[PDB]
Amino acid sequence: IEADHVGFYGTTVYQSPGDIGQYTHEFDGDELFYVDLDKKKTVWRLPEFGQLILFEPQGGLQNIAAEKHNLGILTKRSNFTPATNEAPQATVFPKSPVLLGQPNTLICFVDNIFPPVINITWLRNSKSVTDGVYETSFLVNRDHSFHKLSYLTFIPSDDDIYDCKVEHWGLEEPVLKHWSSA
Amino acid sequence: KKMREIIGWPGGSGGERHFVHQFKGECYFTNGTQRIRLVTRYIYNREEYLRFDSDVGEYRAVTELGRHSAEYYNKQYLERTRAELDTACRHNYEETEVPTSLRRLEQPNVAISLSTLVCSVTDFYPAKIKVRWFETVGVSSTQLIRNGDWTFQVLVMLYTCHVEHPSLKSPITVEW
Ligand SMILES: *[C@@H]1O[C@H](CO)[C@@H](O)[C@H](O)[C@H]1NC(C)=O
Numbered sequence A: 001i002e003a004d005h006v007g008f009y010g011t012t013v014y015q016s017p018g019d020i021g022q023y024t025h026e027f028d029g030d031e032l033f034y035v036d037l038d039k040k041k042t043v044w045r046l047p048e049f050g051q052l053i054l055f056e057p058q059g060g061l062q063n064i065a066a067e068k069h070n071l072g073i074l075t076k077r078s079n080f081t082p083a084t085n086e087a088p089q090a091t092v093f094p095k096s097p098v099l100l101g102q103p104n105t106l107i108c109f110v111d112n113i114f115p116p117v118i119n120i121t122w123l124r125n126s127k128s129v130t131d132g133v134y135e136t137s138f139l140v141n142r143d144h145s146f147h148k149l150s151y152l153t154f155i156p157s158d159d160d161i162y163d164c165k166v167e168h169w170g171l172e173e174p175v176l177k178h179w180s181s182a
Numbered sequence B: 001k002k003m004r005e006i007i008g009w010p011g012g013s014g015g016e017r018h019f020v021h022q023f024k025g026e027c028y029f030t031n032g033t034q035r036i037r038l039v040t041r042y043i044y045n046r047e048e049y050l051r052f053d054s055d056v057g058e059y060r061a062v063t064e065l066g067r068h069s070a071e072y073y074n075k076q077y078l079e080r081t082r083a084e085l086d087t088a089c090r091h092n093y094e095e096t097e098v099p100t101s102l103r104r105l106e107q108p109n110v111a112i113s114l115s116t117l118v119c120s121v122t123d124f125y126p127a128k129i130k131v132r133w134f135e136t137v138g139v140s141s142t143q144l145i146r147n148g149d150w151t152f153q154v155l156v157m158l159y160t161c162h163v164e165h166p167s168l169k170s171p172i173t174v175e176w
Helices: A047-052 A058-077 B064-081 B083-099
Strands: A005-015 A018-026 A031-037 A041-045 A089-094 A104-113 A119-124 A134-135 A145-153 A161-167 A176-182 B017-030 B036-046 B045-053 B110-112 B117-124 B128-131 B153-159 B162-163 B171-175
Touching: A005 A058, A005 B083, A018 A058, A031 A134, A041 A047, A041 B017, A047 B128, A058 B017, A058 B036, A089 A161, A089 A176, A104 A119, A119 A134, A119 A145, A145 A161, A161 B083, B036 B064, B036 B083, B045 B064, B064 B083, B110 B162, B110 B171, B117 B128
Parallel strands: none
Antiparallel strands: A005 A018, A005 B017, A018 A031, A031 A041, A089 A104, A104 A145, A119 A161, A134 A145, A161 A176, B017 B036, B036 B045, B110 B117, B117 B153, B128 B162, B162 B171
């Protein structure tokens, strides 16, 4: 299906148990913003946009209400057909050309995520890294699966070994995408 | 300065594990807003069972799961839904998507290195870009890489690296 530009609006995803909802917008792939449902607030991926345009968070909270509703409906109709757990595919690569000593961002691209529940964690030399870690929302695929990106701010050095650890229900053992300056 | 949403409508029924439901609103633009298309999807888990479509003009069952659903949504939301091609699509594009996305220009950082030389083009937006070596063969580039922060990157393998990207007035070059 061909075009010039593709905007995703009203893209909603509810799931249970846990009442886990997610509402987002996109444009040519890149996420405009998501809506923090707990805090009823629009959170733009690029702040400049949030200062130029506005999205009433309520318009997103309704699709959640609608999708929460539709979920219980289709669940019964489907004869309580549970979602199947697909295995994710991780990939690690630096945001910009590697330079020893100079600030960079390490990116962990994860694909084939379903359901939209995952744990992408970072490891420096087999050590949990919490700070300087940033994720995207769950971005939709035509598969009606999801992909997600994790970002690690770091200083490139040859004596550092990095790992992207992915924990999903579709996995008996976590993925461990190895990456290092070498 | 108001971006609007595409309404995912509530359905009707009749007739412990983990379950998922998704709604997808999608606008496909060409020549700006000359040709605009609105596809709508209702998805239990990963099964799209119901769908609206500008080109079709109405809701249609995609699978057995949306069989009596198509009729319902037509009787109910066909009115407001068909109109969303202008209240949401044609709107968002001309009003909120131009001053932001379509206006975003990000200049690429070029840098060559010996792994076979690798020309690293990074942090550029939009995706539209053309790069050449200064030869036709011995060439091999990676697929365009989406960083997910509204910047792309691509690495062409193989001396000047010529790069022509919209965000630039004059195509920049880098020698080795
Ligand atoms: C659920 O159960 C009914 C009764 O056996 C069956 O006929 C129907 O096909 C099932 N629903 C679907 C769409 O899987």
